[PDB]
Write a protein that binds this DNA or RNA. Structure first.
Ligand SMILES: [Mg+2]
Ligand SMILES: [Mg+2]
Ligand SMILES: [Mg+2]
Ligand SMILES: [Mg+2]
Ligand SMILES: [Mg+2]
Ligand SMILES: [Mg+2]
Ligand SMILES: [Mg+2]
Ligand SMILES: [Mg+2]
Ligand SMILES: [Mg+2]
Ligand SMILES: [Mg+2]
Ligand SMILES: [Mg+2]
Ligand SMILES: [Mg+2]
Ligand SMILES: [Mg+2]
Ligand SMILES: [Mg+2]
Ligand SMILES: [Mg+2]
Ligand SMILES: [Mg+2]
Ligand SMILES: [Mg+2]
Ligand SMILES: [Mg+2]
Ligand SMILES: [Mg+2]
Ligand SMILES: [Mg+2]
Ligand SMILES: [Mg+2]
Ligand SMILES: [Mg+2]
Ligand SMILES: [Mg+2]
Ligand SMILES: [Mg+2]
Ligand SMILES: [Mg+2]
Ligand SMILES: [Mg+2]
Ligand SMILES: [Mg+2]
Ligand SMILES: [Mg+2]
Ligand SMILES: [Mg+2]
Ligand SMILES: [Mg+2]
Ligand SMILES: [Mg+2]
Ligand SMILES: [Mg+2]
Ligand SMILES: [Mg+2]
Ligand SMILES: [Mg+2]
Ligand SMILES: [Mg+2]
Ligand SMILES: [Mg+2]
Ligand SMILES: [Mg+2]
Ligand SMILES: [Mg+2]
Ligand SMILES: [Mg+2]
Ligand SMILES: [Mg+2]
Ligand SMILES: [Mg+2]
Ligand SMILES: [Mg+2]
Ligand SMILES: [Mg+2]
Ligand SMILES: [Mg+2]
Ligand SMILES: [Mg+2]
Lengths: 155, 130
RNA sequence: UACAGGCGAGAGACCGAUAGCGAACAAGUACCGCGAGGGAAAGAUGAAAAGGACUUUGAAAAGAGAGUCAAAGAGUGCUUGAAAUUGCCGGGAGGGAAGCGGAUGGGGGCCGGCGAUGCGCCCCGGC
RNA sequence: UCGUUCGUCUGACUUGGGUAUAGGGGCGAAAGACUAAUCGAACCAUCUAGUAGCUGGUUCCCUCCGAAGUUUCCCUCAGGA
RNA sequence: UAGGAGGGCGCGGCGGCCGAUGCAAAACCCGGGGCGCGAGCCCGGGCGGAGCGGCCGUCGGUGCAGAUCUUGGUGGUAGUAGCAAAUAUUCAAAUGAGAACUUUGAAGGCCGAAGAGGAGAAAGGUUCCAUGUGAACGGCACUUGCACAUGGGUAAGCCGAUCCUAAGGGAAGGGGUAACCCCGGCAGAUAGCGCGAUCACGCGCAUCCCCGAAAGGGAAUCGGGUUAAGAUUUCCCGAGCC
RNA sequence: CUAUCCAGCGAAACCACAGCCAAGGGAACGGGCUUGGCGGAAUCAGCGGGGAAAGAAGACCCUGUUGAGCUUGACUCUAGU
RNA sequence: CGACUCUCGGCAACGGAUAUCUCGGCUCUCGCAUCGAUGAAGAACGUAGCGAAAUGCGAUACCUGGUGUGAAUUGCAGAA
């Protein structure tokens, strides 16, 4: 529909979005944050490496509890980061969808880079769990909206 | 101003009466006006609209479109007229809706009951003017 | 003479969906309790379904183009669409709180009723 | 509730189904125990918006005036005249 | 301060007056400009798409920061606490978009028969069986399912109920009771009369009606087959019995 | 077997604002005030000193012209006999 | 330059306030007098080409009949 941002050059832009996707908002937010400004070819390989547990995603805002590793040392010195598998797959779906959108229009696929990636919270879905002494507590999910725009790099 | 203390002047009741009227009552409510030529000929202003009548739209975006009544679809307070249509997105054709108070009946589907009904209405409009 | 029931009416300085009856809606319903009993939530696309053909990516849901419409960014829980809280982009500051009151300095951002050019003598040349 | 350990096990024994006793009532090898997670009087509705000298709260602005903890009486001393 | 009064501001109707609005009303939004000591007010820009405002009088369910206030929504906590009983899985292949979790085969283990096996009573009610399936749900996942959708499926003279009585319950006349109701042995032409007769009459009438057990009492069945799902004895074949 | 690290899933209690100390004064034991000591991003695992930590309108004690269970030589009655 | 935290603005979310409504409610006033053994009120089960609920009806089952009106019902299909 409308994204938070207008493409800087709309003629050389392709865009993809997905709403109400059952993946964790917090992990998906960190995945997107670490992808911003990347060229597409690096974006696809970076995410695939996380899936194969070869590269990591730094966690910065939502990090209280996350373990430490050597892989994320280059970007986050405190070593704190994970490999959100489900988040990476969902973004790869939309990254490939936006890539397909560009080939329809005619953009230079190897000149594309992620111009804008945004994650927003969706309507939470409700389940419930059972606690001691005959009590019920909510057991809810945190689905997200994702929108991205690839833009041809200009000199 | 009303005099009969048995007819209601309340917005709530008059609306209920309109929107819950039975089929025999919607025939009167969905009434149309005679054309200038027919009003001159039969000395009646308006009539309840019929299946095979001929009309001309005088207010809608289809103003100035003539055609034949093909359906008096009382449940929606509407009539469909032949060739007064638009096309759906898929390309199919549907009949668009017209309210009887926005057409003139350019030609009458006359029967024994219609001839008697025109008489009774004509006997009336003269019975006050004279 | 009386008349919170029944049926049939007519009104109002009444309420306007957390209000008004518990119930504007398949409301004494769903649901709970062995039972007597208890008892909700929930209205609004558009003038008209004209409710989005077709192409392309995808296992699909869906997306991107497109099409309808005055409008879809009005897209079947759809008029408007506040706040709390959240994401992105741009800017600013930080040695165990922050916010606040008075001063002013630096940046922003904005203000043309933000700030005037007219009145008196005069000489024509016409009204 | 779970684990280990324990009491009893031919008896005043264990147990299903049927039936009887109902709230100042029942039933009790008696602990005020039990009577549907409710017992020194169950639960449900109503009287009922029960009463409270006691606790909490009590919604816009400016301007003007501005206190008392003292007297007397009160089953009066956290109250009122 | 407690407290009292005056003058104003603001909200919603009613009687009157004066007006705005599809050349864009209300509501809402803003680092926009101003007015007022203040309550508040006026204008700009945007959004929206059809109603609204000022003045005089008058009226009221008329002003919120609190009440462990009511209802709804939302955070931080926090991607944290946590997912640890019942010994246990592994290899190939098939399937599939996707397999640690489905299926087949092989191996290794467990329940160890007072069983984690085979069948019932109560209770449930379609969970049974086949085919298919987007979401949800199955606190990971799933091609999967006790989920969802569409269909199918329960066959009796012999198994039961049904019959009989138990503890016990209800009950007609009668006794009580303001009445609802409470009393069954109190004994009343007690309900019903029973039996032989019909081609009519006779006899006898005693402790007496009903309910109450799918574990008590009790007419009668066995073996072999058959379905995706019915039957060991309901269907088919044969052979019997009441 | 946990805790621990990873994929997936994912609560709740609590919450004025917060969160380094010493002395002083103060509602007589301060996180904030006064005066001093100091004080450098962002993170992980633990721990039980403090937050007079959470839980619950103290059950002890007092007050109230609030009750209730029980008793009797309390007052006033009452079924029974 | 950066990460984090706080903050200002723009856009996008979350949520359903506000405004504008309303076949509903509440209040007042009026008229009338009509359940049942000739089986009532209430309960149950059925009933439509495609229906679960509500509404309606009863094996004549979202109706039969008469009368009035005078050409539809409608989500789709069909006799018309
Ligand atoms: Mg931990
Ligand atoms: Mg429980
Ligand atoms: Mg209501
Ligand atoms: Mg209600
Ligand atoms: Mg618009
Ligand atoms: Mg709109
Ligand atoms: Mg509109
Ligand atoms: Mg909307
Ligand atoms: Mg906000
Ligand atoms: Mg920033
Ligand atoms: Mg300052
Ligand atoms: Mg300044
Ligand atoms: Mg033990
Ligand atoms: Mg033993
Ligand atoms: Mg033993
Ligand atoms: Mg027993
Ligand atoms: Mg027993
Ligand atoms: Mg004792
Ligand atoms: Mg009160
Ligand atoms: Mg006090
Ligand atoms: Mg009012
Ligand atoms: Mg009030
Ligand atoms: Mg408030
Ligand atoms: Mg206050
Ligand atoms: Mg964890
Ligand atoms: Mg555990
Ligand atoms: Mg045995
Ligand atoms: Mg099955
Ligand atoms: Mg799951
Ligand atoms: Mg019997
Ligand atoms: Mg038996
Ligand atoms: Mg038996
Ligand atoms: Mg046979
Ligand atoms: Mg994890
Ligand atoms: Mg100190
Ligand atoms: Mg403190
Ligand atoms: Mg200091
Ligand atoms: Mg530090
Ligand atoms: Mg720690
Ligand atoms: Mg501690
Ligand atoms: Mg506390
Ligand atoms: Mg207390
Ligand atoms: Mg006293
Ligand atoms: Mg007492
Ligand atoms: Mg005495």
């Amino acid at each position: 529909v409308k994204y938070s941002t207008d493409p800087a050059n709309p003629t050389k832009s392709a865009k993809a979005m997905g709403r109400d996707l059952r993946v964790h908002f917090k992990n998906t937010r960190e995945t997107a944050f670490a992808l911003r400004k990347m060229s597409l070819n690096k974006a696809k390989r970076y995410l695939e490496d996380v899936l194969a547990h070869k590269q990591a995603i730094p966690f910065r805002r939502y990090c209280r509890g996350v373990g430490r590793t050597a892989q994320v040392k280059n970007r986050q010195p405190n070593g704190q980061g994970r490999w959100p598998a489900k988040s990476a797959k969902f973004v790869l779906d939309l990254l490939k969808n936006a890539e397909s959108n560009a080939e329809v229009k005619g953009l230079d696929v190897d000149a594309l880079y992620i111009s804008h990636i945004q994650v927003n919270q969706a309507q939470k879905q409700r389940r419930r769990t059972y606690r001691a002494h005959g009590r019920i507590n909510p057991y809810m999910s945190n689905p997200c909206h994702i929108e991205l725009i690839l833009s041809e790099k200009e000199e | 101003m009303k005099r009969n203390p048995r007819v209601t002047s309340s917005r709530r009741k008059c609306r209920k009466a309109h929107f819950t009227a039975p089929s025999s009552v919607r025939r009167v409510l969905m009434s149309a006006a005679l054309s200038s030529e027919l009003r001159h000929k039969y000395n009646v202003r308006s009539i309840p609209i019929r299946k095979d009548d001929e009309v001309q739209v005088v207010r809608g975006t289809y103003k100035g479109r003539e055609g034949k009544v093909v359906q008096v679809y009382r449940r929606r307070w509407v009539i469909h007229v032949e060739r007064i249509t638009r096309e759906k997105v898929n390309g199919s054709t549907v009949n668009v809706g017209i309210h009887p108070s926005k057409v003139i009946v350019t030609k009458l589907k006359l029967d024994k009951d219609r001839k008697a009904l025109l008489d009774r209405k004509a006997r009336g409009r003269a019975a006050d003017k004279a």
